Amino acid sequence: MPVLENRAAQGDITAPGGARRLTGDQTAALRDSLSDKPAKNIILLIGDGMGDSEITAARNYAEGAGGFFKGIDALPLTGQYTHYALNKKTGKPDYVTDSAASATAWSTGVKTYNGALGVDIHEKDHPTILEMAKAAGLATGNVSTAELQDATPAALVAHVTSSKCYGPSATSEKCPGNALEKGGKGSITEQLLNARADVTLGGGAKTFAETATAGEWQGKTLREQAQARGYQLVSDAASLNSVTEANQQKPLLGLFADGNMPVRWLGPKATYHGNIDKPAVTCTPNPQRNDSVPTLAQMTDKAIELLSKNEKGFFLQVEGASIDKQDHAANPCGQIGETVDLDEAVQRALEFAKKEGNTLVIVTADHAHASQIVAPDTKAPGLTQALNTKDGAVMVMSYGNSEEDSQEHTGSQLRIAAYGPHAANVVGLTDQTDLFYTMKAALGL
């Protein structure tokens, strides 16, 4: 089963045929990309807020307009999917999802209301793909550059009526029906610990310093609970690297930041008339990010390594979470940098999948976002920035959909791409909830 090896511009983009990404007919290559044998493993990679615009902008800057993402762009089977949520009262569509309702959709196969994690509009719990994988004897992995309590990772492990229910205090206040001391299953962090994926890697160390109000581990911080329950805790690159096994006897929990993990690139925030009155920007490495903090690729590496020891197979989710957060912050360098960071993780995933040959790799986003690519001389009403790209030309980005401090999600359908067994099920128009049923059928759960 082939990967797309090189769909860069093949020539002189100014000459006839020089911008072509194809060197010949694709019918045979695509025939060869279609198998309905069982997936042994799945790797799902989510660029949070990574719409087609975010992919294009990132490619334009980092690789040139005619360049090629050896990870993101390399998956042969592509479609567009819909990620609309539901209004909680009416059950009618709500055309722009948040991260919680969208992650709930691919992870349980039920649509839900903005802010819901692993529950439906009736607040009824539904099983997640990770829970099902594990129940079937599969190894399970949950990796993110966000706090692990954030919606995308949390959706695989927690069932709560509001995604703000990070730890015991939040939960008692905002999700009283989920609060442990009220007879509920507990906060997001408490539920994550109960779920006991083999491998869990991200930020969100700070919520683990809260103490439980009830239950078996009442009166201990959640970290202590984790330790008392046999988890291996690591906090940096070197300690992650040292881990040699992860399973149900010795699950791995990696906590790499108090909150979200730091982004890799620095650049200024976009500003009003920024493309006109401020110089073109070149992104630079983020000086506030220590090399000791593992990258998404490094996290993804170790996770594959440890999960792949399972004879029966694994489920792994990997989230480039700060594409979204930097898009909210109108920061093109931040956003682009996190798209590049995700492309690196996709590369590791496909290289693994290629050699093993029974692994379904999926790359998409939870919803679209604000950023747009506009003409260099645009006079726009929102925040803009000129950037010096790999091509040696200026690209302007625009953030035009919020007068408040945060730019907003958008509701456009967006790219979903796949490689490997059952990848066909991503092609054409689908819904985010199909992804659940695709993964479930692929793994035979």
Q: Which of residues 30-59 bind Zn ion (CB under 5 A)?
A: 48
Q: Per the structure block, which two tokens stand in for 364?
A: 């998409």
- Which bin fits 414, alpha (ψ -120 to 50), beta or left (φ > 0)? beta
Contact between 321 and Mg ion by CB under 5 A: the answer reads yes
Confirm whether residue 152 is marked as ligand binding: yes
- Pairing assessment for the beta strands 372-374 and 314-320 based on DSSP bridges: unpaired
Could you report how far apart the first and last alpha carbons of the chain are, in Å? 24
Please report which helix (H) or strand (E) contains residue 344, including its range.
helix 332-356
For residue 35, the minimal CB distance to a copy of itself (Å) is 7
> Which amino acid type is present at position 356?
E
For residue 109, the minimal CB distance to Mg ion (Å) is 19
According to CB under 8 A, which one of 38, 80, 247, 298 is a site residue for a copy of itself? 80
- Is 107 among the catalytic positions? no
According to CB under 5 A, which one of 324, 341, 343, 344 is a site residue for Zn ion? 324
Contact between 13 and a copy of itself by CB under 8 A: the answer reads yes
Cα 103 to Cα 117: distance, rounded to the nearest angstrom: 8
Q: Which of residues 91-110 bind a copy of itself (CB under 8 A)?
A: 91-96, 105, 108-110
Tokens 């590791």 found at: 348
Please report which helix (H) or strand (E) contains residue 169, including its range.
helix 168-174
Please report which helix (H) or strand (E) contains residue 50, including its range.
none
For residue 323, the minimal CB distance to Mg ion (Å) is 9
Contact between 232 and a copy of itself by CB under 8 A: the answer reads no
Site track 174-193 with Zn ion (rule: CB under 5 A), x = hit: --------------------
Contact between 387 and Mg ion by CB under 5 A: the answer reads no
> Which amino acid type is present at position 372?
Q
For residue 394, the minimal CB distance to Mg ion (Å) is 26
Longest pairwise C-alpha distance within the chain: 72
Q: Which of residues 124-153 bind a copy of itself (CB under 8 A)?
A: 126
Q: Which of residues 342-401 bind Zn ion (CB under 5 A)?
A: 366
Active-site choice (33, 35, 53, 99): 99
Helix/strand/coil for 187: coil
Helix/strand/coil for 278: coil
Confirm whether residue 367 is marked as ligand binding: yes
Supply φ then ψ for residue 78, to 5 degrees. -130, 150
According to CB under 8 A, which one of 294, 320, 382, 420 is a site residue for a copy of itself? 382
Tokens 């093993």 found at: 356
Binding site: which residues? 48, 150, 152, 319, 324, 328, 366-367, 409
Residues in contact with Mg ion by the rule CB under 5 A: 48, 99, 152, 321
Binding site for Zn(2+): which residues? 48, 324, 328, 366-367, 409
